[PDB]
mmCIF file of C-alpha atoms in Angstrom:
data_model
loop_
_atom_site.group_PDB
_atom_site.id
_atom_site.type_symbol
_atom_site.label_atom_id
_atom_site.label_comp_id
_atom_site.label_asym_id
_atom_site.label_seq_id
_atom_site.Cartn_x
_atom_site.Cartn_y
_atom_site.Cartn_z
ATOM 1 C CA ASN K 188 24.460 -11.200 3.963
ATOM 2 C CA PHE K 189 22.729 -8.293 2.187
ATOM 3 C CA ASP K 190 22.836 -4.731 3.613
ATOM 4 C CA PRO K 191 21.335 -2.511 0.861
ATOM 5 C CA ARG K 192 22.386 1.107 1.235
ATOM 6 C CA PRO K 193 20.753 3.130 -1.553
ATOM 7 C CA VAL K 194 22.378 6.534 -2.072
ATOM 8 C CA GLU K 195 20.877 9.149 0.206
ATOM 9 C CA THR K 196 19.148 11.912 -1.676
ATOM 10 C CA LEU K 197 16.861 13.763 0.735
ATOM 11 C CA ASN K 198 19.078 16.886 0.548
ATOM 12 C CA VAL K 199 19.904 16.712 -3.184
ATOM 13 C CA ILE K 200 18.364 19.605 -5.077
ATOM 14 C CA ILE K 201 17.537 19.035 -8.730
ATOM 15 C CA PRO K 202 18.305 22.219 -10.704
ATOM 16 C CA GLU K 203 15.122 24.019 -11.730
ATOM 17 C CA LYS K 204 16.044 23.685 -15.430
ATOM 18 C CA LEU K 205 15.491 19.869 -15.343
ATOM 19 C CA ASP K 206 11.768 20.186 -14.561
ATOM 20 C CA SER K 207 10.956 20.237 -18.264
ATOM 21 C CA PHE K 208 12.682 16.821 -18.696
ATOM 22 C CA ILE K 209 10.951 15.434 -15.571
ATOM 23 C CA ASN K 210 7.526 16.389 -16.887
ATOM 24 C CA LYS K 211 8.330 15.153 -20.377
ATOM 25 C CA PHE K 212 9.783 11.811 -19.135
ATOM 26 C CA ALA K 213 6.844 11.435 -16.700
ATOM 27 C CA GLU K 214 4.363 11.844 -19.549
ATOM 28 C CA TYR K 215 6.367 9.378 -21.592
ATOM 29 C CA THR K 216 6.402 6.770 -18.778
ATOM 30 C CA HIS K 217 2.641 7.136 -18.248
ATOM 31 C CA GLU K 218 1.999 6.900 -22.006
ATOM 32 C CA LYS K 219 4.110 3.696 -22.293
ATOM 33 C CA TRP K 220 2.302 2.087 -19.357
ATOM 34 C CA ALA K 221 -1.006 3.136 -20.955
ATOM 35 C CA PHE K 222 0.005 1.687 -24.370
ATOM 36 C CA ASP K 223 0.938 -1.630 -22.702
ATOM 37 C CA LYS K 224 -2.356 -1.738 -20.748
ATOM 38 C CA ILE K 225 -4.463 -0.767 -23.784
ATOM 39 C CA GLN K 226 -2.957 -3.322 -26.227
ATOM 40 C CA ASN K 227 -4.012 -5.919 -23.624
ATOM 41 C CA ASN K 228 -7.569 -4.492 -23.891
ATOM 42 C CA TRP K 229 -7.810 -2.305 -20.790
ATOM 43 C CA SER K 230 -10.090 0.756 -20.772
ATOM 44 C CA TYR K 231 -10.826 3.778 -18.596
ATOM 45 C CA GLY K 232 -12.828 3.016 -15.439
ATOM 46 C CA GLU K 233 -13.526 5.160 -12.371
ATOM 47 C CA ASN K 234 -12.100 2.325 -10.222
ATOM 48 C CA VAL K 235 -9.302 -0.262 -10.709
ATOM 49 C CA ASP K 236 -10.687 -3.672 -11.737
ATOM 50 C CA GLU K 237 -8.511 -6.626 -12.845
ATOM 51 C CA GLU K 238 -11.543 -8.649 -13.985
ATOM 52 C CA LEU K 239 -13.109 -5.793 -16.001
ATOM 53 C CA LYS K 240 -9.642 -4.484 -16.946
ATOM 54 C CA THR K 241 -10.493 -0.849 -16.113
ATOM 55 C CA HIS K 242 -8.162 1.810 -14.669
ATOM 56 C CA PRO K 243 -8.688 5.523 -13.817
ATOM 57 C CA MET K 244 -5.142 6.321 -15.048
ATOM 58 C CA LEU K 245 -6.036 5.277 -18.604
ATOM 59 C CA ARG K 246 -6.552 8.931 -19.574
ATOM 60 C CA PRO K 247 -4.253 11.673 -20.996
ATOM 61 C CA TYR K 248 -1.343 12.745 -18.761
ATOM 62 C CA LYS K 249 -2.419 16.372 -19.349
ATOM 63 C CA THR K 250 -5.800 15.571 -17.668
ATOM 64 C CA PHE K 251 -3.981 14.559 -14.429
ATOM 65 C CA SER K 252 -3.893 16.534 -11.171
ATOM 66 C CA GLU K 253 -0.516 17.244 -9.571
ATOM 67 C CA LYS K 254 -0.888 14.266 -7.222
ATOM 68 C CA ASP K 255 -1.491 11.865 -10.117
ATOM 69 C CA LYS K 256 1.391 13.411 -12.081
ATOM 70 C CA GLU K 257 3.558 12.897 -8.994
ATOM 71 C CA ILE K 258 3.082 9.118 -9.330
ATOM 72 C CA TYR K 259 5.319 9.296 -12.414
ATOM 73 C CA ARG K 260 7.527 12.276 -11.476
ATOM 74 C CA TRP K 261 8.651 10.968 -8.021
ATOM 75 C CA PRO K 262 10.643 7.904 -9.213
ATOM 76 C CA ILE K 263 12.319 10.053 -11.936
ATOM 77 C CA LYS K 264 13.232 12.701 -9.394
ATOM 78 C CA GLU K 265 14.681 9.841 -7.302
ATOM 79 C CA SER K 266 16.795 8.665 -10.265
ATOM 80 C CA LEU K 267 18.064 12.169 -11.046
ATOM 81 C CA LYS K 268 18.841 12.870 -7.333
ATOM 82 C CA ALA K 269 21.071 9.745 -7.276
ATOM 83 C CA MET K 270 22.873 10.822 -10.468
ATOM 84 C CA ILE K 271 23.481 14.273 -8.950
ATOM 85 C CA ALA K 272 24.580 12.717 -5.630
ATOM 86 C CA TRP K 273 27.101 10.646 -7.620
ATOM 87 C CA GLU K 274 28.282 13.976 -9.140
ATOM 88 C CA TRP K 275 27.353 13.041 -12.686
ATOM 89 C CA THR K 276 26.761 15.967 -15.035
ATOM 90 C CA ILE K 277 23.493 16.362 -16.927
ATOM 91 C CA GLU K 278 23.667 19.145 -19.496
ATOM 92 C CA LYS K 279 21.424 19.905 -22.442
ATOM 93 C CA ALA K 280 24.076 19.639 -25.215
ATOM 94 C CA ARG K 281 22.027 19.276 -28.383
ATOM 95 C CA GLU K 282 18.536 19.669 -29.700
ATOM 96 C CA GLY K 283 16.872 16.238 -29.318
ATOM 97 C CA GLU K 284 15.816 13.704 -31.953
ATOM 98 C CA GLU K 285 12.305 14.111 -30.463
ATOM 99 C CA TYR K 286 -7.748 8.078 -25.733
ATOM 100 C CA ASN K 287 -5.050 6.646 -28.010
ATOM 101 C CA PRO K 288 -1.482 6.889 -26.595
ATOM 102 C CA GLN K 289 1.334 6.822 -29.186
ATOM 103 C CA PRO K 290 4.646 6.962 -27.245
ATOM 104 C CA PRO K 291 7.888 7.377 -29.272
ATOM 105 C CA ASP K 292 9.803 4.112 -29.756
ATOM 106 C CA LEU K 293 13.040 4.044 -27.786
ATOM 107 C CA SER K 294 14.095 0.729 -29.378
ATOM 108 C CA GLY K 295 16.427 2.384 -31.891
ATOM 109 C CA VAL K 296 18.372 4.296 -29.225
ATOM 110 C CA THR K 297 21.874 2.978 -28.593
ATOM 111 C CA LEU K 298 23.716 3.831 -25.414
ATOM 112 C CA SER K 299 27.491 3.992 -25.407
ATOM 113 C CA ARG K 300 29.423 1.445 -23.317
ATOM 114 C CA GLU K 301 29.885 4.253 -20.763
ATOM 115 C CA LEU K 302 26.170 5.117 -20.521
ATOM 116 C CA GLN K 303 25.480 1.389 -20.268
ATOM 117 C CA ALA K 304 27.935 1.332 -17.315
ATOM 118 C CA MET K 305 26.133 4.249 -15.686
ATOM 119 C CA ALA K 306 22.874 2.304 -16.209
ATOM 120 C CA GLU K 307 24.415 -0.559 -14.170
ATOM 121 C CA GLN K 308 24.993 1.799 -11.235
ATOM 122 C CA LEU K 309 21.456 3.194 -11.413
ATOM 123 C CA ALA K 310 20.142 -0.429 -11.711
ATOM 124 C CA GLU K 311 21.977 -1.563 -8.571
ATOM 125 C CA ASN K 312 20.715 1.510 -6.730
ATOM 126 C CA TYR K 313 17.138 0.587 -7.710
ATOM 127 C CA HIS K 314 17.905 -2.859 -6.338
ATOM 128 C CA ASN K 315 19.183 -1.367 -3.071
ATOM 129 C CA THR K 316 16.167 0.920 -2.816
ATOM 130 C CA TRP K 317 13.813 -2.026 -3.301
ATOM 131 C CA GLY K 318 15.952 -4.078 -0.892
ATOM 132 C CA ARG K 319 16.086 -1.575 1.961
ATOM 133 C CA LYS K 320 12.335 -1.021 1.674
ATOM 134 C CA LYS K 321 11.662 -4.771 1.567
ATOM 135 C CA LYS K 322 13.728 -5.210 4.759
ATOM 136 C CA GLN K 323 11.593 -2.552 6.446
ATOM 137 C CA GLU K 324 8.325 -4.110 5.270
ATOM 138 C CA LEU K 325 9.403 -7.620 6.420
ATOM 139 C CA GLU K 326 10.238 -6.273 9.882
ATOM 140 C CA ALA K 327 6.910 -4.396 10.218
ATOM 141 C CA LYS K 328 5.027 -7.602 9.359
ATOM 142 C CA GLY K 329 6.834 -9.986 11.720
ATOM 143 C CA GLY K 330 10.071 -11.042 10.007
ATOM 144 C CA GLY K 331 10.948 -13.549 7.310
ATOM 145 C CA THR K 332 12.911 -13.271 4.097
ATOM 146 C CA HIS K 333 12.905 -12.835 0.339
ATOM 147 C CA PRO K 334 15.007 -14.657 -2.297
ATOM 148 C CA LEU K 335 16.041 -11.414 -4.024
ATOM 149 C CA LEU K 336 17.573 -9.925 -0.852
ATOM 150 C CA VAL K 337 21.047 -10.502 -2.232
ATOM 151 C CA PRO K 338 23.678 -8.144 -3.712
ATOM 152 C CA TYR K 339 22.669 -6.904 -7.200
ATOM 153 C CA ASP K 340 25.829 -8.417 -8.719
ATOM 154 C CA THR K 341 24.749 -11.929 -7.580
ATOM 155 C CA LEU K 342 21.357 -11.675 -9.288
ATOM 156 C CA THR K 343 20.815 -13.576 -12.520
ATOM 157 C CA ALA K 344 20.492 -11.791 -15.857
ATOM 158 C CA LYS K 345 16.742 -12.431 -15.705
ATOM 159 C CA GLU K 346 16.705 -10.951 -12.171
ATOM 160 C CA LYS K 347 18.727 -7.852 -13.214
ATOM 161 C CA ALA K 348 16.447 -7.124 -16.182
ATOM 162 C CA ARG K 349 13.775 -4.874 -14.711
ATOM 163 C CA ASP K 350 16.308 -2.569 -12.974
ATOM 164 C CA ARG K 351 18.503 -2.527 -16.117
ATOM 165 C CA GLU K 352 15.486 -1.684 -18.187
ATOM 166 C CA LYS K 353 14.380 1.249 -15.985
ATOM 167 C CA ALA K 354 17.932 2.646 -16.015
ATOM 168 C CA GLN K 355 18.233 2.194 -19.822
ATOM 169 C CA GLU K 356 14.907 3.967 -20.393
ATOM 170 C CA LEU K 357 16.056 7.000 -18.373
ATOM 171 C CA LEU K 358 19.357 7.348 -20.171
ATOM 172 C CA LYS K 359 17.853 6.717 -23.643
ATOM 173 C CA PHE K 360 15.165 9.309 -23.029
ATOM 174 C CA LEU K 361 17.872 11.722 -21.791
ATOM 175 C CA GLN K 362 19.855 11.034 -24.959
ATOM 176 C CA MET K 363 16.829 11.336 -27.281
ATOM 177 C CA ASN K 364 16.138 14.797 -25.787
ATOM 178 C CA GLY K 365 19.671 16.140 -26.371
ATOM 179 C CA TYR K 366 21.124 15.656 -22.898
ATOM 180 C CA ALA K 367 24.768 14.710 -22.356
ATOM 181 C CA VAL K 368 25.373 12.549 -19.246
ATOM 182 C CA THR K 369 28.982 12.080 -18.013
ATOM 183 C CA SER K 370 30.534 10.718 -14.784
#
């Protein structure tokens, strides 16, 4: 009994003004992925190689085409579309606090109880998005099941972590850049 219904966002229009945040958070997300990969001794390679630990995306975000940028911008647009569809407000209230990638540390950012509660909704929606997609993939490949095809609330803490973390990162980066997010 799991029928994931992620919020529909095909006809949600992100206001033009948010493009600056999208680009900035996309760069950030690429730079954090790059940091992680590099500290584990990955380097730039023209092709992806797990043995050689090379990756073509280990280069500056500014050097990317629009297609490569879109790898990072799409999921963020999907997040923002869901917030908008839920009729949350995102307004720039304040000025914000903010190959060798040095991404700003978001570890010192505290979210209010209320932003943490919003993060829970975004986290579940990520779960539903993953879930609905996984159902489609399993059908296309002949059936079967997956242990995480359960309601988000029934997941363990360990199981909730990755969705919670993505949601947290979005809201902390919104906060760090001076944005106020309310229900």
